[PDB]
Amino acid sequence: GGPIITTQVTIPKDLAGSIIGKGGQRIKQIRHESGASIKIDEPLEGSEDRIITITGTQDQIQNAQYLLQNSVKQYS
DNA sequence: TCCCT
């Protein structure tokens, strides 16, 4: 397998529905097509940013992070 | 529009 590293990313809340998708079909298919793991801290209030924690091999984080930013493309 | 480990 590949090295196991931890990374954290924050996204503007206005995109939370855009990157997460309804029912999670977006965040879920992403973790299935890439096989990466994703944990999100409880939503932040008083802030317009959510915290996403990624955990998997660099390939999974690499394949996963590219998919996260790509989603931010459609909301715009 | 909303979800996950």
Side-chain angles (χ1 to χ4, degrees), chain A residues 4-20:
Chain A
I4 311 294
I5 63 182
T6 182
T7 65
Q8 293 173 347
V9 201
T10 51
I11 45 162
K13 185 179 210 197
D14 265 0
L15 308 178
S18 102
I19 299 174
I20 297 173

Side-chain angles (χ1 to χ4, degrees), chain A residues 5 11 13 17 25 32-33 41 43 58 63 66 76:
Chain A
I5 63 182
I11 45 162
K13 185 179 210 197
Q25 283 181 349
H32 281 286
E33 219 180 351
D41 251 5
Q58 191 184 298
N63 264 358
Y66 184 83
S76 321

Side-chain angles (χ1 to χ4, degrees), chain A residues 17-38:
Chain A
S18 102
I19 299 174
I20 297 173
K22 190 162 193 240
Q25 283 181 349
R26 193 88 200 175
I27 188 169
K28 185 145 17 158
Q29 180 159 8
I30 284 170
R31 294 176 310 168
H32 281 286
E33 219 180 351
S34 156
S37 313
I38 306 177

Side-chain angles (χ1 to χ4, degrees), chain A residues 41-71:
Chain A
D41 251 5
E42 299 199 350
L44 308 186
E45 299 175 352
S47 214
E48 299 183 352
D49 296 329
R50 292 199 184 169
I51 301 163
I52 294 177
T53 299
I54 310 178
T55 307
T57 69
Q58 191 184 298
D59 234 11
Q60 301 189 320
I61 300 171
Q62 177 134 37
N63 264 358
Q65 291 203 346
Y66 184 83
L67 296 164
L68 298 177
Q69 186 173 163
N70 208 15
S71 277

